[PDB]
């Protein structure tokens, strides 16, 4: 038993490791999207940079779980990071739709972890999720939903001018 | 009788209270428009912020009437603030058309109050309306009319790209 | 269904709209108190400004619920804002007593919303209430209770000198 | 006829001279109040300074009418400045009551001048009164009414402590 461990259930420790893997999986998916939009035959560089930044944020989410695990006296256990579901991402609308789904998947995993933490009467873990993760997910989901509404307004996937304008005006200039 | 009261007709006092209610009504309508454009399935954030700012301006107009009433020795009497006419606002063109109508309605109420103040030989109230309200209405009506002309130019309501571009270029970036 | 919506119960969405109305109701009550203390036959201007600021804070609380509703994919539904319970507020002690009651009423509505959010297993909504609303209410209730104790110490309602001194020393100079 | 004169009725010219005299009369009354509160057996120095400043403001109002008269091509005609109605002013409450009456008397003279200017179709004179005089009177009347309400609250005329506190807290420290 770790000398620091107190009120930390084995099931929560394991669930934190699984969540860490999912954060790294999400980071790798966003890295793939970055590389796709950087292709010479895609060439939407502000969209590419949006996904690059999302990839870095997910890696930070992962690292925060590693630090959490050690703070509670659990032990980090790593597994393979599975490659993303696609090798190419179609266009800005398809990528944003995949990102929305991924953010929802990550959100559901965090909500399920909160359920477990609640069941095991772990208020520290509940607070950590509420203060560091759940609102970040709500914000990200809203941002991507707003993007999808604008992409549809701009006539994606058919309207190339619309896609060009989204890259210039809706995502940060890089 | 209030110790400060001089040359202030009961009819003007009552009309000032009614005008105060109308300013608060207009504020609430613009607040509704703000919330509509902030919806994830609408997502025109500069348009949303334009209406949020209009809502705050109307609240300031209301407060200025409250202060006026007390300065003249009248008594503020409040009534329910009726909810706006619509729960959803269609699109930027429909909202701007409703805003134009509302600004005209507010303008007519101010002009009618000026008529009453004139009839009751109240030059202080005439001056207050001319100096604090009437030109603000003319300016706002012109601004919204100019917007409507541009929205029609941009192909609203059908042209989604046009609507996107209006949000980026015609209203202040927020 | 909104594309952003996840783990957000219809009952919570409706309760958020009701809470929004109550915040706007509280804002309007404090606006009425402001106008009362600004009367030439009342003339307690620091008390008036205290209530004006409280009115603006409640409007901010309302706007925060509007933004929350949209972030979760719920839909803002507005109702009439009922006029305050009184047209005149007696004196500083009666107004502070009404403010204490109102802050308790708002607090109970927030606590009831937390109960509902708990029942529907919505940790994001729980966190939002805990982090943005519940402590603000506890602070406000304590501040007003402290004021009431001082008003009674100063001999309200009979002691006019006491009431004058409260305005000069207990509320911020405006 | 003055080479500059245009649309300026003889009756308005005469009424401007009478108004000038009334402004100087009001200045002299406030000067008397200043000297009274500066007496060693009165000794309310912030009250004294309030009246001194009011006296200087009235002299400025007079000078503005002199300049106006010449701008329109009328001719300044001066009359004796009558001494104030009282040689001693009782206390802060009696003086403020006399000041309220005097400000109302000045206001009525300005309103009567506006009536005359209206009758003679002189929009320049109407504007001058509205922009330079009428709101100043409304503000001053409200300020003095608020003072009287506070003086009564503080137990004037009997409550000497109340009178002392008014001088310390309600008027500007000099
Ligand atoms: Cl352990
Ligand atoms: Cl343990
Ligand atoms: Cl425990
Ligand atoms: Cl365990
Ligand atoms: Cl594990
Ligand atoms: Cl942390
Ligand atoms: Cl596998
Ligand atoms: Cl996919
Ligand atoms: Cl693929
Ligand atoms: Cl997914
Ligand atoms: Cl968070
Ligand atoms: Cl452009
Ligand atoms: Cl541009
Ligand atoms: Cl956008
Ligand atoms: Cl009255
Ligand atoms: Cl009157
Ligand atoms: Cl009159
Ligand atoms: Cl009347
Ligand atoms: Cl009324
Ligand atoms: Cl004003
Ligand atoms: Cl009705
Ligand atoms: Cl409408
Ligand atoms: Cl509707
Ligand atoms: Cl309308
Ligand atoms: Cl104006
Ligand atoms: Cl434009
Ligand atoms: Cl929904
Ligand atoms: Cl849901
Ligand atoms: Cl869930
Ligand atoms: Cl539901
Ligand atoms: Cl509802
Ligand atoms: Cl927030
Ligand atoms: Cl009802
Ligand atoms: Cl009440
Ligand atoms: Cl009442
Ligand atoms: Cl209540
Ligand atoms: Cl809080
Ligand atoms: Cl002090
Ligand atoms: Cl205190
Ligand atoms: Cl001449
Ligand atoms: Cl002439
Ligand atoms: Cl003419
Ligand atoms: Cl003539
Ligand atoms: Cl003359
Ligand atoms: Cl001038
Ligand atoms: Cl004589
Ligand atoms: Cl007198
Ligand atoms: Cl005398
Ligand atoms: Cl007089
Ligand atoms: Cl003025
Ligand atoms: Cl003191
Ligand atoms: Cl005072
Ligand atoms: Mg050990
Ligand atoms: Mg274990
Ligand atoms: Mg993450
Ligand atoms: Mg594989
Ligand atoms: Mg937080
Ligand atoms: Mg946004
Ligand atoms: Mg009275
Ligand atoms: Mg009346
Ligand atoms: Mg207005
Ligand atoms: Mg109705
Ligand atoms: Mg004017
Ligand atoms: Mg102007
Ligand atoms: Mg313009
Ligand atoms: Mg949809
Ligand atoms: Mg529902
Ligand atoms: Mg509140
Ligand atoms: Mg009712
Ligand atoms: Mg909790
Ligand atoms: Mg807190
Ligand atoms: Mg305190
Ligand atoms: Mg000549
Ligand atoms: Mg003549
Ligand atoms: Mg004067
Ligand atoms: Mg004489
Ligand atoms: Mg006029
Ligand atoms: Mg003015
Ligand atoms: Mg004041």
- Which tokens in the block code for residue A15? 């669930």
Name B68's Cβ contacts closer than 8 Å, sequence gap at least 6.
B16, B128
Query: Is B14 at the interface with chain C, CB within 8 A?
Result: no
- Which tokens in the block code for residue A125? 């873990």
Distance in Å, alpha carbon of B42 to nearest chain A alpha carbon: 7
Which positions 108-147 of A are in contact with C (Cβ < 8 Å)?
Answer: 108, 111, 114-115, 118, 126, 129-131, 134-135, 138-139, 141-142, 145
Place of tokens 């202060």: B67
Task: Give CA–CA dist D39/D92, Å, rounded.
Answer: 13
Please give, one letter per residue, the 3-state secondary structure of chain C.
CCCCCCCCCHHHHHHHHHHHHHHHHHHHHHHHHHHHHHCCCCCCHHHHHHHHHHHHHHHHHHHHHHHHHHHHCCCCCCCCECCCCCCCCCCHHHHHHHHHHHHHHHHHHHHHHHHHHHHCCCHHHHHHHHHHHHHHHHHHHHHHHHHHHHHHHCCCCCCHHHHHHHHHHCCCCC
DSSP D172: P
- Which tokens in the block code for residue A133? 């993760």
Provide the experimental method for this PDB entry. X-ray
Helix, strand or coil, per DSSP, at residue B147: helix
Residues linked to residue C81 through DSSP beta bridges, in sequence order: B81
Give A42-111 as a DSSP string.
T--HHHHHHHHHHHHHHHHHHHHHHHHHHHHT--------PPPS-S---SHHHHHHHHHHHHHHHHHHHH
Task: Answer yes or no: are the C-beta atoms of C93 and C148 closer than 8 Å.
Answer: yes
Chains B and A physically touch (3 or more Cβ atom pairs below 8 Å): yes
Containing H/E element for B172? none
- Measured in angstroms, the resolution is 1.5
Cβ atoms < 10 Å from Cβ of B86: 14
Whether residue C124 and residue A145 make contact (CB cut-off 8 A), yes or no, is: no
DSSP B5: -
Does C157 sit behind a cis peptide bond, omega within 30 degrees of 0 on the bond before it? yes
Residues of B within 8 A of A146 (CB-CB) are 40, 43, 45
Taking Cα atoms as reference points, which of C133, A115, C59 lies closest to residue B62?
C59
Task: Give CA–CA dist C39/A95, Å, rounded.
Answer: 61
Residues followed by a break in chain C (C to N exceeding 2.5 Å) are none
Task: Give CA–CA dist B75/C88, Å, rounded.
Answer: 10
Sign (positive or negative) of CA dihedral D109, D113, D119, D120: positive
Task: Answer yes or no: are the C-beta atoms of D110 and D19 closer than 8 Å.
Answer: yes
Taking Cα atoms as reference points, which of C100, C81, C94 lies closest to residue C138?
C100
Place of tokens 């991507």: A144
Phi, psi of D101, deg, nearest 5: -60, -45
Name A132's Cβ contacts closer than 8 Å, sequence gap at least 6.
A64
Task: Answer yes or no: are the C-beta atoms of D14 and D76 closer than 8 Å.
Answer: no
Task: Give CA–CA dist A9/A121, Å, rounded.
Answer: 9
Whether residue B78 and residue C84 make contact (CB cut-off 8 A), yes or no, is: yes
With vertex at residue A166, the alpha carbon angle to CA A165 and CA A172, rounded to the nearest 5 degrees, is 110
Task: Give CA–CA dist D164/D156, Å, rounded.
Answer: 10
Task: Give CA–CA dist C40/B3, Å, rounded.
Answer: 8
Which of C4, C7, C70 is nearest residue A111 as measured by Cβ atoms?
A: C7
Taking Cα atoms as reference points, which of D153, B17, B1 lies closest to residue C91?
D153
Residues of C within 8 A of A129 (CB-CB) are 123
With vertex at residue A29, the alpha carbon angle to CA A27 and CA A31, rounded to the nearest 5 degrees, is 70
Task: Give CA–CA dist B22/B27, Å, rounded.
Answer: 9
Taking Cα atoms as reference points, which of A143, A61, A62, A60 lies closest to residue A100?
A143
Helix, strand or coil, per DSSP, at residue B81: strand
Task: Give CA–CA dist A4/C68, Å, rounded.
Answer: 38
Helix, strand or coil, per DSSP, at residue A173: coil
DSSP B134: I
State the ligand closest to the CA atom of C84: 34
Proportion of chain D in helix, strand, coil states, percent, rounded to 5? 70, 0, 30
Instruction: Give the CA count within 13 Å in the CB-facing half-sphere of C138.
Output: 8
Give D87-131 as a DSSP string.
S---SHHHHHHHHHHHHHHHHHHHHHHHHHHHHTT-HHHHHHHII
Whether residue B164 and residue A161 make contact (CB cut-off 8 A), yes or no, is: no
- Farthest-apart Cα atoms in chain B, separation: 61
D123: CA distance to ligand 25 center in Å?
Answer: 19
Which of C2, C3, C72 is nearest residue A138 as measured by Cβ atoms?
A: C72
A50: CA distance to ligand 9 center in Å?
Answer: 20
Task: Give CA–CA dist C44/C167, Å, rounded.
Answer: 6
Residues in chain B: 174
Task: Give CA–CA dist A135/B41, Å, rounded.
Answer: 20
Containing H/E element for A154? none
Task: Give CA–CA dist D34/D55, Å, rounded.
Answer: 8
Cβ atoms < 10 Å from Cβ of D131: 12
From residue B55, alpha-carbon distances to B29, B50, B59, D35 in Å are 8, 9, 7, 51
B26: CA distance to ligand 61 center in Å?
Answer: 7
Whether residue D134 and residue B126 make contact (CB cut-off 8 A), yes or no, is: no
DSSP A39: S
From residue D3, alpha-carbon distances to A75, B8, C119, D71, D121 in Å are 100, 40, 87, 11, 20
- Which tokens in the block code for residue A167? 């890259």
DSSP B157: T
Task: Answer yes or no: are the C-beta atoms of C121 and C155 closer than 8 Å.
Answer: no
Domain D1-174 fold: Ferritin (1.20.1260)
Task: Answer yes or no: are the C-beta atoms of A62 and A24 closer than 8 Å.
Answer: yes
Phi, psi of B171, deg, nearest 5: -105, 155
With vertex at residue D107, the alpha carbon angle to CA B126 and CA C34, rounded to the nearest 5 degrees, is 65
Place of tokens 């110790």: B3
- Which tokens in the block code for residue B108? 């007519």
Using a 10 angstrom Cβ sphere, with 0-12 exposed, 13-18 middle and 19 or more buried, the burial of residue A106 is: buried
Task: Give CA–CA dist B154/B152, Å, rounded.
Answer: 5
Identify how many contiguous H helices and E strands chain D contains and give both numbers: 6, 0
Name C169's Cβ contacts closer than 8 Å, sequence gap at least 6.
none
Residues linked to residue B81 through DSSP beta bridges, in sequence order: C81
D84: CA distance to ligand 49 center in Å?
Answer: 10
Name A164's Cβ contacts closer than 8 Å, sequence gap at least 6.
A44
């Amino acid at each position: 038993v770790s000398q620091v461990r107190q009120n930390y259930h084995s099931d929560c420790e394991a669930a934190v490791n699984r969540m860490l893997n999912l954060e790294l999986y999400a980071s790798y998916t966003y890295s793939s999207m970055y590389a796709f939009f950087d292709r010479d035959d895609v060439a939407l560089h502000n969209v590419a940079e949006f996904f690059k930044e999302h990839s870095h944020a997910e890696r930070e989410h992962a690292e925060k779980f590693m630090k959490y695990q050690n703070k509670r006296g659990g032990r980090v256990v790593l597994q393979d990071i599975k490659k993303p579901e696609r090798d190419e991402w179609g266009n800005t609308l398809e990528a944003m739709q995949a990102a929305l789904q991924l953010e929802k998947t990550v959100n559901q995993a965090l909500l399920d972890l909160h359920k477990l933490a609640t069941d095991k009467v772990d208020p520290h873990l509940c607070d950590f999720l509420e203060s560091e993760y759940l609102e970040a997910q709500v914000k990200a989901i809203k941002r991507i939903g707003d993007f999808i509404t604008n992409l549809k307004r701009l006539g994606l996937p058919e309207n190339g001018m619309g896609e060009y304008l989204f890259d210039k005006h809706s995502v940060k200039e890089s």
